[PDB]
């Protein structure tokens, strides 16, 4: 355990910052999906009627 | 100061409204009805328009030929039009031919034959009208605009109706429509020009006394529309001119923002490259458009109905690579109604409107149309003094407040027709309805 700490002394801080990053990034991923779908819905919902000239 | 509009009622509830002008020698008399295509359902859509055709196809007494002769002998003409909420049938004649014309109108409205033979004959005429409105680009654009803005609602239907209904309209449904809707409490007999009010009331008692009253008489101009932000694109690369309309939900006739919406509409105003004065107009949009050649024309509108309206602009342009600029600058001028307008623009537009609202009424038909429209939408003729007061009460604060709730960041209905490849998708147009800098 001690030598593992010596090799990677940032370990404890790194993992706690990782937890914060995971949470924020996940939330932003969810919101970016909502916002993409919101903006794209006029394209996805488009309908056509063709009357051959 | 114009002569007073006199108004009387009959017992059935028919209103008679008149404005005499002893300086003219002609008179416009007619019947303004508070009914139109909106009163149809989806099955009889087109009935109101169909009836307008058959009204001139012969009555219980006079045949079609006799009808023609009678009007020709009077010397003037008859005219009729059906809209979404209003039907009009009028007669322009000489001063002393007014009793004849009232008699003819009463006859075609109350005692029309609606013979199966005539129904069948008109069914082809009206079918042909479906394939010839296609040319009237402005009408095409505005019919699609209503269809999309009021999606699957009565205001969204066309007046002509679908092809299917035209082939299946019977004399029964025609008779039912006009019996339910053309009731005395929904009708106004209007005279303008060389008419005596007292003479007109006598003629009304003689000809329109046996009109049915409706079971539940509501006041004149009594109506829920749910506007849909949406677009219709009718791209046609072979047309040289693009026609584009953009609208938001506007105001009804009796809205408290009625005049504020008219003032806002006048700040943007109209433009036409063919008119010599248009390059010098005060409107900011007009200056941008003329300096950059962005359009052949634009026309601001504020159309009202009993319970809703559409407020927007209609553009025509040959500049097919700068349609984006045209629409961009138009919506940026609308943004300024929320962010920037001050007493400068507002007082200017009020000045222009104070005159405009009076100027419009420059002949007997225009006056009759004004009386009839006001009586069927408001239940009264609003005097120029009242109109001058309502306009004076519009402040810059009112315009900004109105624009911030009606235009700013709101859904639009958008119709484009013609070479509209340069018109961006819905989102990019609708994003111009606000300013990120504000
Ligand atoms: C260069 C590499 C880019 C990748 C960045 C991802 C994470 C790096 C952030 C550092 C970090 O550990 O932040 C954590 C939170 O993560 C987060 O919440 C950050 C994730 C956010 C995703 C990216 C959003 C914009 C980032 C890029 C913009 C940079 C320039 C723009 C001005 C916790 O750290 P802490 O919360 O203790 O930090 C002190 C403030 N309390």
Coordinates of C-alpha atoms and ligand atoms in Angstrom, one line a residue:
Chain A
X1 CA 0.0 0.0 0.0
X2 CA 2.8 2.5 1.0
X3 CA 4.7 1.9 -2.3
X4 CA 1.5 2.3 -4.3
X5 CA 1.0 5.6 -2.6
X6 CA 4.6 6.5 -3.4
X7 CA 4.1 5.8 -7.1
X8 CA 0.9 7.7 -7.3
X9 CA 0.4 10.3 -4.5
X10 CA -2.3 12.2 -6.4
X11 CA -4.5 9.0 -6.2
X12 CA -7.0 10.2 -3.6
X13 CA -7.4 13.6 -5.0
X14 CA -7.6 12.4 -8.6
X15 CA -10.4 10.0 -7.8
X16 CA -12.5 12.6 -5.9
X17 CA -12.1 15.1 -8.8
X18 CA -13.1 12.2 -11.1
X19 CA -16.3 11.8 -9.2
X20 CA -17.1 15.5 -9.7
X21 CA -16.2 15.3 -13.4
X22 CA -18.3 12.2 -13.9
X23 CA -21.4 13.8 -12.4
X24 CA -21.2 17.1 -14.2
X25 CA -20.3 15.5 -17.6
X26 CA -23.1 12.9 -17.3
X27 CA -25.6 15.7 -16.5
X28 CA -24.3 17.7 -19.5
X29 CA -24.5 14.7 -21.7
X30 CA -28.2 14.2 -20.8
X31 CA -29.0 17.9 -21.3
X32 CA -27.1 18.0 -24.7
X33 CA -29.3 15.1 -25.8
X34 CA -32.5 17.0 -24.8
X35 CA -31.2 20.1 -26.6
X36 CA -30.2 18.3 -29.7
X37 CA -33.6 16.6 -30.0
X38 CA -35.4 19.8 -29.3
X39 CA -33.6 21.7 -32.0
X40 CA -33.8 18.8 -34.5
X41 CA -37.6 18.0 -34.1
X42 CA -38.7 20.3 -37.0
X43 CA -36.4 18.3 -39.3
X44 CA -37.3 15.0 -37.9
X45 CA -41.0 15.8 -38.0
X46 CA -41.0 17.2 -41.6
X47 CA -43.8 15.9 -43.9
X48 CA -44.1 16.2 -47.7
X49 CA -46.9 16.2 -50.2
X50 CA -45.8 15.7 -53.8
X51 CA -48.0 16.6 -56.8
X52 CA -46.1 15.6 -59.9
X53 CA -46.0 18.7 -62.2
Chain B
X1 CA -66.4 66.3 -39.9
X2 CA -68.4 63.6 -41.8
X3 CA -72.2 63.2 -41.4
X4 CA -73.4 61.0 -38.5
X5 CA -74.1 57.3 -39.1
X6 CA -77.8 56.7 -38.4
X7 CA -78.7 53.3 -37.0
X8 CA -82.1 51.6 -36.5
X9 CA -83.4 48.1 -35.8
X10 CA -86.4 46.1 -36.9
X11 CA -88.5 43.8 -34.7
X12 CA -86.8 40.7 -36.0
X13 CA -83.5 42.2 -35.0
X14 CA -82.2 43.4 -38.4
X15 CA -79.9 46.4 -38.1
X16 CA -80.2 49.3 -40.6
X17 CA -77.2 51.6 -40.7
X18 CA -76.8 54.5 -43.1
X19 CA -74.5 57.4 -43.9
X20 CA -75.9 60.0 -46.3
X21 CA -73.8 62.2 -48.7
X22 CA -75.9 64.8 -50.6
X23 CA -72.8 65.6 -52.8
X24 CA -72.9 62.2 -54.6
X25 CA -75.5 60.9 -57.0
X26 CA -75.0 57.2 -56.5
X27 CA -75.8 54.9 -53.5
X28 CA -74.3 51.6 -52.3
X29 CA -76.8 49.5 -50.4
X30 CA -76.2 46.0 -49.2
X31 CA -76.4 43.3 -46.6
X32 CA -73.4 42.6 -44.3
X33 CA -73.7 39.2 -42.6
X34 CA -71.8 38.1 -39.6
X35 CA -71.3 34.5 -41.0
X36 CA -68.8 33.0 -43.4
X37 CA -66.7 29.9 -44.1
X38 CA -65.8 29.6 -40.4
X39 CA -69.4 28.5 -39.7
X40 CA -69.1 25.4 -41.8
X41 CA -67.7 22.1 -40.5
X42 CA -65.3 19.8 -42.4
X43 CA -68.2 18.1 -44.3
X44 CA -69.9 21.2 -45.7
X45 CA -66.7 23.3 -46.1
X46 CA -67.3 25.3 -49.3
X47 CA -71.0 25.8 -48.8
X48 CA -70.9 29.5 -48.1
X49 CA -68.9 30.1 -51.3
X50 CA -71.1 27.8 -53.3
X51 CA -74.2 29.7 -52.2
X52 CA -72.7 33.0 -53.4
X53 CA -72.6 31.5 -56.9
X54 CA -76.2 30.2 -56.7
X55 CA -77.6 33.5 -55.3
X56 CA -77.2 34.9 -58.8
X57 CA -78.6 31.8 -60.6
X58 CA -82.3 32.7 -60.2
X59 CA -85.1 33.1 -57.6
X60 CA -88.7 31.8 -57.1
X61 CA -89.9 34.7 -59.2
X62 CA -87.1 36.0 -61.6
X63 CA -85.1 33.4 -63.5
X64 CA -81.4 33.8 -64.1
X65 CA -82.1 35.7 -67.4
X66 CA -84.8 37.9 -65.8
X67 CA -82.4 38.6 -62.9
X68 CA -79.7 39.7 -65.4
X69 CA -82.2 41.9 -67.2
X70 CA -83.5 43.5 -64.0
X71 CA -80.0 44.6 -62.9
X72 CA -79.1 45.8 -66.4
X73 CA -82.3 47.9 -66.4
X74 CA -81.5 49.4 -63.0
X75 CA -78.2 50.6 -64.6
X76 CA -75.8 49.8 -61.7
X77 CA -74.3 46.5 -60.6
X78 CA -74.4 43.9 -57.9
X79 CA -71.4 42.4 -56.1
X80 CA -70.8 39.8 -53.4
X81 CA -67.9 38.3 -51.5
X82 CA -67.6 35.6 -48.8
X83 CA -64.7 35.6 -46.3
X84 CA -64.0 33.5 -43.3
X85 CA -66.2 35.4 -40.9
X86 CA -68.1 37.8 -43.1
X87 CA -70.4 37.6 -46.2
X88 CA -71.4 40.8 -48.1
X89 CA -74.0 41.3 -50.9
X90 CA -74.3 44.8 -52.1
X91 CA -75.8 46.9 -55.0
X92 CA -74.4 50.1 -56.4
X93 CA -77.1 52.1 -58.2
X94 CA -78.4 55.6 -58.9
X95 CA -80.1 57.6 -56.2
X96 CA -83.6 56.8 -57.3
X97 CA -82.9 53.1 -58.1
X98 CA -82.3 52.2 -54.5
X99 CA -85.8 50.7 -53.9
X100 CA -85.3 48.4 -56.9
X101 CA -81.8 47.2 -55.6
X102 CA -83.0 46.6 -52.1
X103 CA -85.9 44.5 -53.6
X104 CA -83.4 42.4 -55.7
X105 CA -81.1 41.8 -52.7
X106 CA -83.9 40.7 -50.5
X107 CA -85.1 38.3 -53.2
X108 CA -81.7 36.6 -53.9
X109 CA -81.1 36.1 -50.1
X110 CA -84.5 34.9 -49.0
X111 CA -86.1 33.3 -52.0
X112 CA -83.3 31.7 -54.1
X113 CA -84.3 28.6 -56.1
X114 CA -81.1 26.4 -55.5
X115 CA -82.3 24.1 -58.3
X116 CA -80.4 20.8 -58.8
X117 CA -79.7 21.7 -62.4
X118 CA -78.0 24.9 -61.4
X119 CA -76.1 23.2 -58.5
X120 CA -74.7 20.7 -61.1
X121 CA -73.7 23.4 -63.5
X122 CA -71.8 25.5 -60.9
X123 CA -70.1 22.3 -59.6
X124 CA -67.9 22.5 -62.7
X125 CA -67.3 26.2 -62.5
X126 CA -66.1 26.0 -58.9
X127 CA -64.0 22.9 -59.8
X128 CA -62.2 25.1 -62.4
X129 CA -61.7 27.8 -59.7
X130 CA -59.6 25.4 -57.7
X131 CA -57.0 25.2 -60.6
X132 CA -56.8 29.0 -61.3
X133 CA -56.3 30.4 -57.8
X134 CA -52.9 28.7 -58.3
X135 CA -51.9 31.8 -60.3
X136 CA -52.9 34.3 -57.6
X137 CA -49.7 34.0 -55.6
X138 CA -50.7 36.3 -52.7
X139 CA -53.9 34.4 -52.2
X140 CA -52.1 31.1 -52.3
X141 CA -49.6 32.3 -49.7
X142 CA -52.4 33.6 -47.4
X143 CA -54.5 30.5 -47.7
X144 CA -51.6 28.4 -46.7
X145 CA -50.8 30.8 -43.9
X146 CA -54.2 30.3 -42.3
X147 CA -54.1 26.6 -43.0
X148 CA -50.8 26.2 -41.0
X149 CA -51.3 28.9 -38.3
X150 CA -54.8 27.5 -37.4
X151 CA -53.9 23.8 -38.1
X152 CA -57.0 21.6 -38.2
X153 CA -59.2 24.4 -36.9
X154 CA -62.2 26.2 -38.6
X155 CA -60.1 29.4 -39.4
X156 CA -57.6 27.0 -41.0
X157 CA -60.0 25.9 -43.8
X158 CA -60.1 27.6 -47.2
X159 CA -63.3 29.4 -48.4
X160 CA -63.6 27.3 -51.7
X161 CA -63.4 24.1 -49.6
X162 CA -62.0 20.7 -50.8
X163 CA -62.7 19.2 -54.3
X164 CA -64.5 16.4 -52.6
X165 CA -67.1 18.7 -51.0
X166 CA -67.7 20.5 -54.2
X167 CA -68.8 17.3 -55.8
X168 CA -71.1 16.4 -52.9
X169 CA -72.8 19.8 -52.0
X170 CA -76.6 19.4 -52.2
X171 CA -79.4 21.9 -52.3
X172 CA -80.4 20.6 -48.9
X173 CA -77.1 21.5 -47.2
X174 CA -77.1 24.8 -49.0
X175 CA -80.6 25.6 -47.7
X176 CA -79.7 24.4 -44.2
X177 CA -76.6 26.6 -44.2
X178 CA -78.4 29.8 -45.1
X179 CA -81.3 29.1 -42.8
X180 CA -79.1 28.6 -39.8
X181 CA -76.7 31.5 -40.5
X182 CA -78.5 34.2 -42.5
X183 CA -80.7 35.3 -39.6
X184 CA -81.9 38.8 -38.9
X185 CA -79.8 39.3 -35.8
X186 CA -76.7 38.5 -37.8
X187 CA -77.5 40.9 -40.7
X188 CA -77.0 44.6 -41.2
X189 CA -78.6 46.5 -44.1
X190 CA -76.2 49.3 -44.9
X191 CA -76.7 52.4 -47.1
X192 CA -74.0 54.9 -48.1
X193 CA -74.2 57.9 -50.4
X194 CA -77.4 59.2 -51.8
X195 CA -79.7 57.3 -49.4
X196 CA -82.3 58.6 -46.9
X197 CA -82.1 56.6 -43.7
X198 CA -85.9 56.8 -43.2
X199 CA -86.5 55.5 -46.7
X200 CA -84.1 52.7 -46.2
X201 CA -85.8 51.6 -42.9
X202 CA -89.1 51.6 -44.8
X203 CA -87.7 49.4 -47.5
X204 CA -86.3 47.1 -44.8
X205 CA -89.7 46.7 -43.2
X206 CA -91.1 45.9 -46.7
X207 CA -88.6 43.3 -47.8
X208 CA -86.6 42.0 -44.8
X209 CA -89.4 41.7 -42.2
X210 CA -90.0 38.0 -42.7
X211 CA -86.4 37.0 -41.8
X212 CA -86.0 34.3 -39.2
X213 CA -84.5 35.3 -35.9
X214 CA -81.9 32.9 -34.3
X215 CA -82.9 30.9 -31.2
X216 CA -80.1 32.5 -29.1
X217 CA -79.4 36.1 -30.3
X218 CA -75.8 36.9 -29.3
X219 CA -74.5 40.5 -30.0
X220 CA -73.0 41.3 -33.4
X221 CA -69.3 40.2 -33.8
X222 CA -69.4 37.5 -31.1
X223 CA -67.0 34.5 -31.8
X224 CA -60.8 28.8 -29.2
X225 CA -58.0 29.3 -31.8
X226 CA -54.7 27.8 -30.8
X227 CA -52.0 29.1 -33.0
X228 CA -49.4 26.7 -34.3
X229 CA -45.8 27.8 -35.0
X230 CA -45.1 26.0 -38.3
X231 CA -44.0 26.3 -41.9
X232 CA -45.2 25.5 -45.4
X233 CA -42.7 25.5 -48.2
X234 CA -43.9 25.4 -51.7
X235 CA -40.7 25.5 -53.6
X236 CA -40.9 26.2 -57.3
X237 CA -37.6 26.9 -59.0
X238 CA -39.3 27.8 -62.2
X239 CA -41.0 30.9 -60.6
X240 CA -38.8 34.1 -60.8
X241 CA -40.3 35.8 -57.7
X242 CA -40.3 34.3 -54.2
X243 CA -43.4 35.1 -52.1
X244 CA -43.0 34.8 -48.3
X245 CA -45.3 35.5 -45.5
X246 CA -44.4 35.5 -41.8
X247 CA -46.9 36.0 -39.0
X248 CA -47.5 35.6 -35.3
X249 CA -50.8 35.3 -33.6
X250 CA -52.2 38.9 -33.6
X251 CA -55.3 40.6 -32.1
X252 CA -59.0 40.3 -32.4
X253 CA -61.3 43.2 -33.3
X254 CA -62.2 44.0 -29.8
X255 CA -58.8 43.4 -28.2
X256 CA -57.5 46.1 -26.0
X257 CA -54.3 46.0 -28.0
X258 CA -56.1 46.5 -31.3
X259 CA -54.7 50.0 -31.9
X260 CA -51.4 49.3 -30.4
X261 CA -51.0 46.4 -33.0
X262 CA -51.9 48.8 -35.8
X263 CA -49.4 51.4 -34.7
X264 CA -46.7 48.7 -34.5
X265 CA -47.7 47.5 -38.0
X266 CA -47.3 51.1 -39.3
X267 CA -43.8 51.5 -37.9
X268 CA -42.7 48.7 -40.2
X269 CA -45.1 49.8 -43.0
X270 CA -45.1 48.9 -46.7
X271 CA -42.7 49.2 -49.5
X272 CA -42.9 48.8 -53.3
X273 CA -40.0 49.5 -55.7
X274 CA -42.5 50.5 -58.4
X275 CA -43.8 53.5 -56.4
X276 CA -41.5 56.6 -56.7
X277 CA -41.9 57.7 -53.1
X278 CA -41.0 54.4 -51.5
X279 CA -37.3 54.9 -51.6
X280 CA -37.7 57.9 -49.3
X281 CA -40.0 56.4 -46.6
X282 CA -39.1 56.9 -42.9
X283 CA -39.4 53.1 -42.0
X284 CA -36.1 51.6 -41.2
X285 CA -36.9 48.3 -43.0
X286 CA -37.9 50.2 -46.1
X287 CA -34.5 51.9 -46.1
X288 CA -32.6 48.7 -45.6
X289 CA -34.6 46.9 -48.3
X290 CA -34.4 49.7 -50.9
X291 CA -30.7 50.5 -50.4
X292 CA -29.8 46.8 -50.8
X293 CA -32.4 45.8 -53.4
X294 CA -33.6 43.0 -51.2
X295 CA -37.2 42.9 -52.3
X296 CA -39.7 44.0 -54.9
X297 CA -42.2 44.8 -52.2
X298 CA -43.3 44.1 -48.6
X299 CA -46.7 44.7 -46.9
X300 CA -47.2 44.6 -43.2
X301 CA -50.6 43.4 -42.1
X302 CA -52.6 43.0 -38.9
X303 CA -55.6 40.8 -39.8
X304 CA -58.3 40.5 -37.1
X305 CA -61.0 38.0 -36.4
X306 CA -63.6 37.8 -33.7
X307 CA -61.4 35.8 -31.3
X308 CA -57.8 35.9 -32.8
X309 CA -55.8 37.5 -35.6
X310 CA -52.5 37.3 -37.6
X311 CA -49.9 40.0 -37.5
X312 CA -47.0 39.8 -39.9
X313 CA -45.5 40.7 -43.2
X314 CA -45.8 39.6 -46.8
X315 CA -42.6 39.9 -48.9
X316 CA -41.9 39.5 -52.6
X317 CA -38.4 39.2 -53.9
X318 CA -36.4 38.3 -57.1
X319 CA -33.2 38.4 -55.1
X320 CA -32.9 34.7 -54.6
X321 CA -29.4 34.7 -53.1
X322 CA -30.3 37.3 -50.4
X323 CA -33.6 36.0 -49.2
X324 CA -31.7 35.2 -46.0
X325 CA -30.7 38.9 -45.7
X326 CA -34.3 40.1 -46.4
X327 CA -35.8 37.8 -43.7
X328 CA -32.9 38.6 -41.3
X329 CA -33.4 42.4 -41.5
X330 CA -37.2 42.1 -41.4
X331 CA -37.1 40.2 -38.1
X332 CA -34.4 42.5 -36.7
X333 CA -36.8 45.4 -37.3
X334 CA -39.5 43.5 -35.4
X335 CA -37.0 42.9 -32.6
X336 CA -36.6 46.7 -32.3
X337 CA -40.4 47.0 -31.5
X338 CA -39.5 45.3 -28.2
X339 CA -36.1 46.7 -27.6
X340 CA -35.6 50.2 -29.2
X341 CA -38.8 51.9 -30.2
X342 CA -39.3 55.3 -28.6
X343 CA -41.6 58.3 -29.0
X344 CA -39.8 59.0 -32.3
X345 CA -41.2 56.1 -34.3
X346 CA -44.5 55.8 -32.3
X347 CA -45.6 59.5 -32.8
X348 CA -44.7 59.3 -36.5
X349 CA -46.8 56.2 -37.0
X350 CA -49.7 57.6 -35.1
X351 CA -49.6 60.7 -37.3
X352 CA -49.7 58.5 -40.4
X353 CA -52.6 56.4 -39.1
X354 CA -54.8 59.2 -37.8
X355 CA -55.1 60.3 -41.5
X356 CA -54.9 56.7 -43.0
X357 CA -58.0 55.5 -41.2
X358 CA -60.1 58.3 -42.6
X359 CA -58.4 58.5 -46.0
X360 CA -59.4 54.9 -46.8
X361 CA -63.1 55.9 -47.0
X362 CA -63.1 57.8 -50.3
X363 CA -66.2 56.5 -52.1
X364 CA -69.7 55.2 -51.3
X365 CA -68.6 51.5 -51.5
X366 CA -65.7 52.2 -49.2
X367 CA -68.0 53.9 -46.7
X368 CA -70.6 51.1 -46.9
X369 CA -67.8 48.5 -46.4
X370 CA -66.6 50.5 -43.3
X371 CA -70.1 50.8 -41.8
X372 CA -70.8 47.1 -42.5
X373 CA -67.5 45.8 -41.2
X374 CA -67.7 47.8 -38.0
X375 CA -71.3 46.9 -37.3
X376 CA -70.7 43.2 -37.9
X377 CA -67.4 43.0 -35.9
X378 CA -67.9 45.6 -33.1
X379 CA -71.7 46.0 -33.0
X380 CA -71.4 49.8 -33.6
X381 CA -69.8 52.4 -35.9
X382 CA -66.9 54.0 -34.1
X383 CA -66.9 57.7 -34.7
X384 CA -63.6 59.3 -35.9
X385 CA -63.4 61.2 -32.6
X386 CA -63.3 57.9 -30.6
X387 CA -60.8 56.5 -33.1
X388 CA -58.6 59.6 -32.7
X389 CA -58.7 59.2 -29.0
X390 CA -57.9 55.5 -29.0
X391 CA -54.9 56.2 -31.3
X392 CA -53.7 59.1 -29.1
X393 CA -53.7 56.8 -26.1
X394 CA -51.1 54.5 -27.7
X395 CA -47.7 55.3 -26.1
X396 CA -44.2 53.9 -26.8
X397 CA -44.5 52.0 -23.6
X398 CA -47.7 50.3 -24.9
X399 CA -45.9 49.3 -28.2
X400 CA -42.9 47.9 -26.4
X401 CA -45.1 46.0 -23.9
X402 CA -47.2 44.6 -26.7
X403 CA -44.2 43.6 -28.8
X404 CA -42.6 41.9 -25.8
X405 CA -45.6 39.7 -25.3
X406 CA -46.6 39.1 -28.9
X407 CA -43.5 39.1 -31.0
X408 CA -40.4 38.7 -28.9
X409 CA -39.1 35.2 -29.0
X410 CA -42.5 33.9 -30.3
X411 CA -43.4 31.1 -32.7
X412 CA -44.1 32.2 -36.2
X413 CA -46.1 30.8 -39.1
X414 CA -44.1 30.9 -42.2
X415 CA -45.1 30.3 -45.8
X416 CA -42.7 30.4 -48.7
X417 CA -43.6 30.0 -52.4
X418 CA -41.3 30.0 -55.4
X419 CA -37.4 30.0 -55.6
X420 CA -37.0 29.7 -51.8
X421 CA -33.9 27.5 -51.6
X422 CA -32.2 30.5 -49.8
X423 CA -34.9 30.6 -47.2
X424 CA -33.3 28.9 -44.1
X425 CA -35.0 26.2 -42.0
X426 CA -37.6 27.0 -39.3
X427 CA -35.1 27.3 -36.4
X428 CA -32.8 29.9 -38.1
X429 CA -35.8 32.0 -39.0
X430 CA -37.4 31.7 -35.5
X431 CA -34.0 32.4 -33.9
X432 CA -34.2 35.9 -35.4
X433 CA -37.3 36.5 -33.2
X434 CA -35.0 37.6 -30.4
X435 CA -31.7 39.4 -30.1
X436 CA -28.8 37.8 -28.1
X437 CA -27.4 41.3 -27.5
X438 CA -30.6 42.3 -25.5
Ligands
LIG1 C1 -8.0 20.2 -21.2 C2 -8.7 19.0 -20.9 C3 -10.2 19.1 -21.1 C4 -11.1 18.1 -20.3 C5 -11.7 18.7 -19.1 C6 -12.5 17.7 -18.2 C7 -12.2 17.7 -16.7 C8 -11.1 18.6 -16.3 C9 -11.6 19.6 -15.2 C10 -10.7 19.5 -14.0 C11 -11.4 18.8 -12.9 O1 -10.9 17.9 -12.2 O2 -12.6 19.4 -12.6 C12 -13.6 18.7 -11.8 C13 -15.0 19.0 -12.3 O3 -15.1 18.7 -13.7 C14 -15.9 19.4 -14.4 O4 -17.0 19.7 -14.0 C15 -15.4 19.7 -15.7 C16 -16.1 19.0 -16.8 C17 -16.8 20.0 -17.7 C18 -16.8 19.6 -19.2 C19 -16.2 20.7 -20.1 C20 -16.9 22.0 -20.1 C21 -16.0 23.1 -20.5 C22 -14.6 22.8 -20.3 C23 -13.6 23.3 -21.3 C24 -13.6 24.9 -21.4 C25 -12.3 25.5 -21.2 C26 -12.2 26.9 -21.8 C27 -13.4 27.8 -21.9 C28 -13.5 29.1 -21.1 C29 -13.4 18.9 -10.3 O5 -12.6 20.1 -10.1 P1 -13.1 21.1 -9.0 O6 -14.6 21.3 -9.2 O7 -12.5 20.8 -7.6 O8 -12.4 22.5 -9.5 C30 -12.4 23.7 -8.7 C31 -13.6 24.5 -8.8 N1 -14.5 24.3 -7.7

